[PDB]
C-alpha cells in the first residue's frame, strides 16, 4: 500500500479554515485531516486546556489563524503552550510546518521570538518585499492582523513590509503573517462577523475588501499553489532545526 | 537561641550578584547565603548540569540575573530546568521567592508562562506603570534586558512598561524584569564587560548610563530597601501557589 503524504490543518478558530491551502495541498497529492482547537461555543471564552494530536503522524502540520492574541496570559497558560509544545515536537521529528497569521505568530513564540501589538495594522491586500521570490512571491497577499512577531533566534526572515515581518524559515518551518488561503467565501465568513468594522470606522470597509478580493481571485489561487509547492520543495527539504 | 530569617541568593552568572538587595535583606535582619550556578570559567559555555540546594532551608530564595536566554535549549536541557524545579519545590513548601531579570523570567517559565526575544531592548533607567505603588514603586528602575515574558497563568501583573511586563506576583513569589539591586560598582562590572556596546553603537552609551546611575544612587538605595520590606510584608504573607 502506497503512503500518500499527510497534512493536518489546525483550526485554531472555527472560521479560519484551510480554504485554498487545502486545495493546494490536495493538488500536491496530500491526504488532508483537520483538528479543532477552539470550538464555536468558546469563541468568546477561548481559554482552556486542549489535547493536541501526535504530530509525527503527519508529514506537514499547518496551524491556521485566529482572532485572539497568541501571548494572552490565559491562552499561553492553557492551549497555546500545548500547541507550542506540539510544534517543537514536530520540528524535532522532522515534520514540516506551515503557520499562517496567528499560526505564524505561534511559531515565532514557540522558538523564542515574542509577539506584540503592531504600531500599524494591515487590513487588506498588500505587496511585500521578499529575498526569495521563488518561495515567497511579492504578492499581493491578503492581510488582517494587529499583532506582529519578532523573528525568532536561528530563523531567517524571508519577506517583510515596512509594517511587519511577513515570512521566516526555521528548519522545515515556514511562518507567514498573511493569509495565502483566502478566497471569496472565506472572506465573507470573516466580513459577516466583523461587527465593529461594518461601519468603516477602523480604516477599511467591507465593500472595498470584497471588491479587491473579487478581482484578485484567479491570481491569488495560482500563488497559493506555487507557495505550497515551493514550501515542499525548499523548506521541508532543509535540515530540521529549533 | 534566636533564629534569624535566612535568604539564599542564587548567582546565575558571576557578575550579577546581590549588591544592594543583600544590604536590604541584611538590614531587614536576614542571614545571607549564596549559591553559584555558572562559575566564571563557564561564562562562555554555561550549559551543563548543576545540583541545586534544598530551598526549604531558607525563608526566601532569590534567583538573580544572567546574560543567557532562559529559553536556550541547552540550558533548559540542563540547569535551567533544575532551577525551575527548585523554584516549584520552594513555592510548594511556602518559601518566599524574589526573581530578578533572568530570575524573574525563569519564574515566568517555571509556572507556565513564556519568555521570548523582545522587539525593543530596554537598557537604562525607566519609570514603570504600577497598580500598587506600595509594592512596586514607579521608580525609575534600572533595566538591561533583551527578552520579555508573558505572565504565567494564575499570576497577577503588578507593573509594566509599554515595552514589557515588569513585575508579577504568584503566591509568595515576586518576579521582576528590572534590577533594583544595581549600584555604581555593580554597573561598572557590567560596563567593563560590555564589549559590543562601549562604542555606543547599540542605542545607548556607557557615559550616559554611568551618569544617570550616579545621579540616582541615593534614591535607588532607598527604593530597594522599601521594595524588600514591602515584598516581605505583602508577598511572603500570601498563600502559596504554583
Ligand atoms: N482573518 C481573520 O479573521 C484574522 C484576523 C485577526 N485579527 C488575526 O489575528 O489575524
Ligand atoms: N542583566 C544584564 O543584562 C546585565 C548586563 C548584560 N548581562 C551584559 O551583557 O553585560
For residue B238, how many other CB atoms are within 10 A of its CB?
A: 15
SS3 A26: helix
* Alpha-carbon gap: A236 to the closest alpha carbon of chain B (Å): 22
Whether B203 contacts chain A with CB within 8 A:
no
- Say yes or no: CB of residue A101 within 6 Å of ligand 1: yes
| Domain contains B241 | no
- Whether A105 has its CB under 8 Å from any CB of chain B: the answer is no
In a domain, B242, yes or no: no
Answer yes or no: are the C-beta atoms of A168 and A156 closer than 8 Å: yes
User: How many angstroms separate the alpha carbon of residue B67 from the centre of ligand 2?
Assistant: 5
In a domain, B139, yes or no: yes
User: For chain B, how many structural domains are there in total?
Assistant: 1
> Which CATH number covers residue A151?
3.40.50.880
Assess whether the C-beta atom of B103 lies below 6 angstroms from ligand 2: no
Method: X-ray
Residue B167 in grid coordinates: 513585575
Query: Quick check: is B114 in a domain?
Result: yes
Query: Is B240 part of any domain?
Result: no
* Ligand 2 contacts CB of residue B194 (under 6 A): yes
Q: CA nearest B180: which of B116, B98, B239, B107?
A: B98
CB atoms B147 and A74 under 8 Å: no
Lookup: cell for A218: 484567479
Q: What is the layout of strands, in order, in the sheet containing B96-100?
A: B31-36, B6-11, B60-63, B96-100, B173-176, B165-170, B156-160, B129-130
- Please name the member of A73, A109, A242 whose beta carbon is closest to the beta carbon of B116: A109
Cell numbers of B19, please? 549588591
Q: Which three cell numbers stand for residue A12?
A: 485554531
Q: Which ligand is nearest to the CA of A17?
A: 1
In a domain, B179, yes or no: yes
Residue B152 belongs to a domain:
yes
Tell me the nearest-neighbour CA distance from A152 into chain B, angstroms.
7
How many Cβ atoms sit within 10 Å of the Cβ of residue A148? 23
**A152/B119 touch (CB, cutoff 8 Å), yes or no:** no
Instruction: For residues B225 and B24, give the distance between their C-alpha atoms in angstroms, rounded to a whole number.
Output: 5
**B171: region left, alpha or beta (phi > 0 left; psi from -120 to 50 alpha):** left
Q: Quick check: B74 contacting A, CB < 8 Å? A: no
Range of the domain at B141: 6-235
Residue A150 has its nearest CB partner, among B69, B115, B117, at: B117
Q: Is residue A188 part of a domain?
A: no
- Report which protein residue has its CA nearest ligand 2's atom 7: B67
Ligand nearest to the CA of A191: 1
- Grid cell for residue A67: 482572532
Min Cα distance B116 → chain A (Å) is 4
Say how many residues make up chain B: 242
Angular region, A154: left φ>0, alpha ψ -120 to 50, beta rest: left
Chain B partners within 8 Å of A74 (Cβ): 153
DSSP B201-221: TTS--HHHHHHHHHHTHHHHH
Q: Which helix (H) or strand (E) holds A148?
A: strand A141-149
Quick check: helix, strand or coil at residue B189? helix
Amino acid at each position: 500500500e502506497f503512503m500518500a503524504p499527510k497534512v493536518l490543518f489546525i483550526h485554531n478558530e472555527h472560521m479560519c479554515t484551510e480554504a485554498m491551502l487545502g486545495d493546494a495541498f490536495s493538488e500536491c497529492g496530500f491526504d488532508i485531516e483537520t483538528f479543532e482547537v477552539v470550538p464555536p461555543e468558546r469563541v468568546e471564552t477561548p481559554a482552556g486546556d486542549v489535547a493536541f494530536p501526535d504530530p509525527t503522524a503527519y508529514d506537514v502540520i499547518v496551524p491556521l489563524g485566529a482572532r485572539w492574541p497568541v501571548y494572552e496570559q490565559s491562552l499561553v497558560g492553557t492551549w497555546v503552550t500545548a500547541e507550542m509544545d506540539m510544534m517543537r515536537k514536530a520540528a524535532d521529528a522532522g515534520v514540516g510546518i506551515l503557520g499562517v497569521c496567528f499560526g505564524g505568530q505561534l511559531l515565532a513564540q514557540t522558538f523564542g521570538g515574542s509577539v506584540a501589538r503592531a504600531e500599524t495594522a494591515e487590513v487588506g491586500w498588500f505587496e511585500l518585499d521578499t529575498d526569495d521570490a521563488g518561495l515567497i512571491a511579492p504578492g499581493p497577499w491578503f492581510q488582517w492582523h494587529f499583532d506582529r512577531w519578532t523573528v525568532p533566534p536561528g530563523a531567517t526572515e524571508i519577506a517583510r513590509t515596512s509594517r511587519s515581518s511577513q515570512a521566516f524559515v526555521l528548519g522545515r518551518a515556514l511562518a507567514l503573517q498573511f493569509h495565502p488561503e483566502v478566497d471569496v467565501d472565506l472572506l465573507e465568513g470573516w466580513l459577516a462577523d466583523d461587527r465593529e468594522g461594518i461601519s468603516g470606522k477602523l480604516g477599511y470597509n467591507h465593500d472595498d475588501l470584497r471588491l479587491r478580493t473579487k478581482e484578485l481571485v484567479d491570481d491569488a489561487a495560482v500563488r497559493v499553489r506555487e507557495l505550497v509547492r515551493a514550501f515542499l520543495d525548499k523548506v521541508v527539504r532543509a535540515d530540521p532545526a529549533s
